[PDB]
Design a protein around this ligand. Structure first.
Ligand SMILES: Cc1ccc2n1CC(c1ccc(C(C)(C)O)cc1)=NC2=O
Ligand SMILES: [Zn+2]
Length: 210
């Protein structure tokens, strides 16, 4: 099944993942309600997720999308937060567990800003926060998020809600782009689980500003 490989803090691969996570934190329009209030994370550990069957399914679909899209699979490294990340690292991404209430319908959603995915680590809108203290801004409990390879192929660009069950005809993903009277941060949506691989598992705490 799945094996987790510990990355060393002195390794450039660990450093690259932490820097993308830290540098993409943003202030969210909800006043921190969903993910808490913070300007930096304390990274506890970063692990590489290794799984032969999951990697084969992801690579097979990536070759298929590349062939359909002028040899451009358009893979992007994106964050994903979910209360079910344990099932994702062992069984892979699955469109059968889509975010039904998402702005683009029943897809699997990713963000280029780590703090946007942090709003979903404890559920939609942050749920009831950490299991132990029921605090969406808990500074004690260790959180987990994924930094994923996501095959986008030909993306359908949108600025506002457009609910759908599957990708638009001729396309492989939907991108919600930021705009003045619209989204603050981008969101990326796929409708097939084999279009994402949970490359890195990050364990962290949000830090209290001071
Ligand atoms: C809209 C958006 C941008 C970035 C993310 N999202 C949603 C989201 C997510 C994950 C899981 C779920 C359930 C259905 C609870 O599994 C719901 C939502 N995770 C994210 O990383
Ligand atoms: Zn807690």
């Amino acid at each position: 099944g799945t094996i987790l490989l510990d990355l060393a803090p002195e390794d450039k691969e660990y450093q690259s993942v932490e820097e993308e996570m830290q540098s993409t934190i943003r202030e969210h329009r909800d006043g921190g309600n969903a993910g808490g209030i913070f300007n930096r994370y304390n990274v506890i550990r970063i692990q590489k997720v290794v799984n032969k069957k999951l990697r084969e399914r992801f690579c097979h679909r990536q070759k298929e999308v590349s062939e359909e899209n002028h040899n451009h699979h358009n893979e992007r490294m994106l964050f994903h937060g979910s209360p079910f990340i344990n099932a994702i690292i062992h069984k892979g991404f699955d469109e059968r567990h889509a975010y039904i209430g998402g702005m683009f319908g029943a897809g699997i959603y990713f963000a280029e800003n780590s703090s946007k995915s942090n709003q979903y680590v404890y559920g939609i809108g942050g749920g009831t926060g950490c299991p132990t203290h029921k605090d969406r801004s808990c500074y004690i409990c260790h959180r987990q998020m994924l930094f994923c390879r996501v095959t986008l192929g030909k993306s359908f660009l949108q600025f506002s809600t457009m609910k759908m069950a599957h990708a638009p005809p001729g396309h492989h993903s939907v991108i919600g782009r930021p705009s003045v009277n619209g989204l603050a941060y981008a969101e990326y949506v796929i409708y097939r689980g084999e279009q994402a691989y949970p490359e890195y598992l990050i364990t962290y705490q949000i830090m209290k500003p001071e």
